[PDB]
Amino acid sequence: GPGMLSILLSASSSYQTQTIGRLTTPGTNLVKAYKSSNPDLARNCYWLYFDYYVHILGYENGFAHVRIGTEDCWISKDSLEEITIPTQSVTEANIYSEPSRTGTIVRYVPANSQVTILDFNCDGFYRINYRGYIGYILEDALQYKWKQIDGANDGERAANLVKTKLGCKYILGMSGPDTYDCSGLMQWAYNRLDIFMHRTADVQDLHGQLIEDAQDILPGDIITFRTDSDNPMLVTHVGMYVGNGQFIHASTNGYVVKYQDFYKYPYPVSTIRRYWTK
Numbered sequence: 001g002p003g004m005l006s007i008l009l010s011a012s013s014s015y016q017t018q019t020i021g022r023l024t025t026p027g028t029n030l031v032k033a034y035k036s037s038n039p040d041l042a043r044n045c046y047w048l049y050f051d052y053y054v055h056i057l058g059y060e061n062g063f064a065h066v067r068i069g070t071e072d073c074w075i076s077k078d079s080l081e082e083i084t085i086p087t088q089s090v091t092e093a094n095i096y097s098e099p100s101r102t103g104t105i106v107r108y109v110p111a112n113s114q115v116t117i118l119d120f121n122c123d124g125f126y127r128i129n130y131r132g133y134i135g136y137i138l139e140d141a142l143q144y145k146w147k148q149i150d151g152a153n154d155g156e157r158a159a160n161l162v163k164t165k166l167g168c169k170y171i172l173g174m175s176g177p178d179t180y181d182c183s184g185l186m187q188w189a190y191n192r193l194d195i196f197m198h199r200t201a202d203v204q205d206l207h208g209q210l211i212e213d214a215q216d217i218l219p220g221d222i223i224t225f226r227t228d229s230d231n232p233m234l235v236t237h238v239g240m241y242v243g244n245g246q247f248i249h250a251s252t253n254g255y256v257v258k259y260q261d262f263y264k265y266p267y268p269v270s271t272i273r274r275y276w277t278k
Contacts (some may be wrong), residue, residue, distance in 0.1 A: 071196035107133035154276035155220025201267035208273030
């Protein structure tokens with residue numbers, strides 16, 4: 001106020017200067033992703049998709065180095081655009097040199113100042129430009145919120161996000177904004193929380209915290225299923241638990257994103273996976 005800093009913040013930061021990207025995938029909906037800026041172009045690690053949000057770590061050799069949560073990869077620089085976000089501060093604060101409790105002061109920012117967000121989710125800070133001064137401001141000092149404040153945890157936030165897509169049409173291979181398949185809905189929802197999961201159900205099945213007893217399931221957990229009786233050991237479907245014994249999924253039954261009663265769903269569960277941590 002403006003000098004108070006919480007002991008819950010680290011006194012050190014390794015957070016590198018980043019910007020915000022939004023995937024535009026010109027002429028299509030996807031872009032190949034790689035694990036280097038000089039890849040074996042035949043061996044892309046996966047793809048990223050139209051209207052996903054990323055952090056941009058830099059550019060090299062025609063690629064953008066992008067990050068979603070703990071995951072980083074390289075995509076063609078023409079597949080995304082840089083984004084800056086105007087907002088205003090609501091309380092006086094300092095812009096600091098880094099997102100820690102020991103940064104130097106770049107500039108004092110009075111309450112009600114117009115600022116521009118350059119990066120988000122920076123360990124409790126945004127990176128901003130105020131009047132040409134650049135650095136990190138505590139995230140609650142700004143009006144703009146990159147994710148819901150409501151909810152006890154990011155699992156509840158993920159459950160809200162899939163609810164916002166109820167009624168969207170099922171289309172194989174899609175991940176929004178208007179159409180989805182089952183696993184694309186999951187990856188999209190977590191993209192909006194800056195958390196990476198892989199794109200297909202059979203890989204989503206292999207990561208996240210394993211919730212071994214269904215009694216322990218919570219909103220935002222994903223449930224994978226084996227639904228193909230000609231390949232009965234393969235994971236082929238996924239949905240997101242949203243509480244009250246229901247999950248939401250994109251289903252070919254109805255060709256729509258809809259609720260489903262978990263206990264009555266007539267296909268075996270493979271795993272329950274928790275990709276949220278706070």
